[PDB]
Amino acid sequence: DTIYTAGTPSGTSGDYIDDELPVYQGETTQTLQDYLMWQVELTPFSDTDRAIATSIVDAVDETGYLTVPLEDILESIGDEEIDIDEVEAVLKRIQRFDPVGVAAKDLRDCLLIQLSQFDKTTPWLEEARLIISDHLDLLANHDFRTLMRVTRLKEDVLKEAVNLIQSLDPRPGQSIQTGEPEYVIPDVLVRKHNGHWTVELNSDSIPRLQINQHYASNLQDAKWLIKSLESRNDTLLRVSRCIVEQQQAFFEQGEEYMKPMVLADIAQAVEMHESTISRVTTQKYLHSPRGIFELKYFFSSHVNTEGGGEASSTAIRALVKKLIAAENPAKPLSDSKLTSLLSEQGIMVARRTVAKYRESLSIPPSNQRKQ
C-alpha cells in the first residue's frame, strides 16, 4: 500500500463529449511483405514473373532471408515449361529491392549482394569481395593468421577490409520492423518487510464489480460468478504464497539457492489436484525486485547430492556460468575439466549433462574461446 512518487501523464482530455465513441475497426500496417509486394507491382514483369515473385515474397521471414529452397518455389508454381534459371533471374531482381539484400539464401549471399552495389572508387573492395567469396569461416573463427597466408596481404589492408565487412548489414529486413513491442503486466508482487517476503495480488489489476441486483434467478447466477472469481483468485494467491515460502533462499541470495520442487510438493501442500496446479501457474508472472519471472520457472529437474538431498538444475547452470566467467583466456576450461572441478563440492553430474547445460546456456566450447 504505497503511492507511486513519479509517473508519466496520458495524452488526452479528462472528459469526452457525451456522444458514444464509434465501434473499434482497426488500422492497416506495412510489414516487410507488403512493401516488397508494393515494389513488385510497380516493376515491369511478365505474368509468370509476377506469379514467381508472389511465391518468392510469400516465403520471406522477418529478418529478410529466404526460408525455402528454390525447388520448393518451382514446384509450387505448378508449371512444367518453367525452369530454375527463370526463378534465379526473378530472385536476383527481387534481391535488389529496398532494403538491398533482402530474400538472400544465406549470410554470404546477403553480404555479396550488398557489396555488389558499391562504386569502384571504394578503397578496399576487391579484398572484401574475395574474403567473403572464398574464406569466410576464417574471419568468423578469429584466425587472422592463416587468412594472412592465403590472402598474401599485410596487416593494414586486411584490417581495413574487415572494417568494411563489419560496416554492412547482416539483417537487412529488420529496418522495417514492428511499431512498438508489447509488455506484460505482473499478476502478483513479492515485497520484503520484517525479514519476510510478503505476497500480494496486483491491486491495479483487480477491481471489484458493481453488484447489479436492484431490478429484482439472475441475481443468484450473478453471485455464482462472484464466488467463482473469489475461488480463482484465492487459489492463485495460495499457490503463489506457498511457492514463495518454499523458494525463500533464492529471493534473498539470488541464483544457486533454488530447491528442486515439482508439482507434487505444491499439490500436497495446498491439498489440490496437480492438474489444477499445472493449469493455474500457466502463463502467469510474478514481479520481484530481481526482475519478472514466470510462475512456472521455479520447477525443474534435480541431480543426486553426495552428502544427501538434491541440487536444482538452475543452480548447476548458474554455477557453470560463474565458473566459465572466471577462466583463463589462454587455456579455456573443457567439459571434463569442468566436471572434475565441480566434483569437489558434492556436485555429481555426468559429462553428457554438463554438455547439455552448456548448450542450453549458449556458450561456445573451449577451442572457440581461446585468446
Binding site: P22, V23, Q39, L42, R96, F97, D98, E182, V184, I185
Partner: protein, 253 residues
C-alpha cells in the same frame, strides 16, 4: 485490443456469447428432463436474448454492458445516421485530398487558383514518380521515392511540369448548391494558405476570417475533361436558380 496483449469483447460478441450460453443451458436442461416450470423461464430468457441480439431495446429494457450505455446490435449497425447507408455508402473519405486556410489573391485570372507547393508535392506524388522514371532520372521506383523524400532540386521542375494544365477541385462546407465545388487551374505559390479569386467568393459564401477549403485531384482523362468542360469557374457565370449572374463585383470593386 487493449495494452498488455489482452482483448475486450465488443457488443456483438457479448450478445453472441449471451445467446450461446442460454442455448447451451437450455439444451442441457432438455437432456436432463428437468421439471417444465424451469424450462419455461429458460426458454423465455433465450427468446429475450435472441431479441436483444437482433434488435436491442425495441421491446422491453435495453441491455447495457457498462457505464449504463446500450449495446449496439445489428439493426443499429444498419440504420441511423451512423449506419452503413448514411456514413460509408452515400459519403466516404477519399485519397488525393487536402485542406488548408484560404487567403485572397487579387492578381489571379478567373480560371486560376493559388496552391502551396508543399501540398502540391504530396497530392501529385505518383505523377511525379512516373515523370521521374520517364526521363531516366530514376531507373527504379525506390530511387524516385528516395529522390522525392530528399526533396532535391529537380523534383520542383518536375512538379511544375506535371501540373501545367491539370485542374483541381476546391470545396467549402456546407455545400448548399452545385456552386460549392468548383474546378481551377493551379499556380504554385510560397506559403501555407490557398489563394482564391475575389469574384468567386459570393458563389462559395466564403470570407477571409478563418475559412478553410478542401482540394481534390481528378485522375482519369474523363475526370479532367469534365473538370475543364463542366465544373470550371469560367462556365458558372449565370445562376442555375435565377439565370442572373453570380460572378458579380462587390465591396471594393
Amino acid at each position: 485490443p487493449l495494452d498488455g496483449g489482452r482483448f475486450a469483447t465488443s457488443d456483438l460478441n457479448d450478445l453472441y456469447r449471451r445467446v450461446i450460453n442460454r442455448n447451451n443451458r437450455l439444451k442441457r436442461l432438455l437432456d436432463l428432463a428437468a421439471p417444465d416450470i424451469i424450462v419455461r423461464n429458460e426458454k423465455r430468457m433465450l427468446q429475450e436474448a435472441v431479441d436483444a441480439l437482433l434488435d436491442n431495446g425495441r421491446r422491453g429494457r435495453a441491455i447495457t454492458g457498462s457505464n449504463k450505455r446500450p449495446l449496439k446490435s445489428l439493426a443499429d449497425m444498419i440504420k441511423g445516421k451512423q449506419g452503413r447507408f448514411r456514413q460509408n455508402l452515400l459519403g466516404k473519405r477519399v485519397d488525393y485530398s487536402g485542406r488548408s486556410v484560404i487567403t485572397v489573391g487579387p492578381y489571379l485570372r478567373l480560371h486560376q487558383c493559388g496552391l502551396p507547393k508543399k501540398m502540391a508535392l504530396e497530392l501529385f506524388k505518383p505523377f511525379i514518380y512516373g515523370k521521374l522514371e520517364l526521363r531516366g532520372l530514376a531507373t527504379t521506383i525506390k530511387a524516385a521515392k528516395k529522390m522525392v523524400e530528399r526533396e532535391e532540386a529537380v523534383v520542383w521542375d518536375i512538379l511544375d511540369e506535371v501540373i501545367r494544365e491539370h485542374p483541381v477541385l476546391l470545396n467549402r462546407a456546407p455545400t448548399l448548391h452545385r456552386l460549392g465545388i468548383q474546378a481551377f487551374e493551379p499556380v504554385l505559390i510560397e506559403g501555407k494558405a490557398i489563394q482564391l479569386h475575389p469574384l468567386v467568393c459570393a458563389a462559395y459564401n466564403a470570407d477571409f476570417d478563418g475559412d478553410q477549403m478542401a482540394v481534390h485531384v481528378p485522375l482519369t482523362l474523363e475526370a479532367q475533361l469534365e473538370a475543364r468542360a463542366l465544373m470550371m469557374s469560367t462556365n458558372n457565370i449565370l445562376s442555375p436558380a435565377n439565370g442572373e449572374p453570380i460572378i458579380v463585383p462587390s465591396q471594393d470593386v
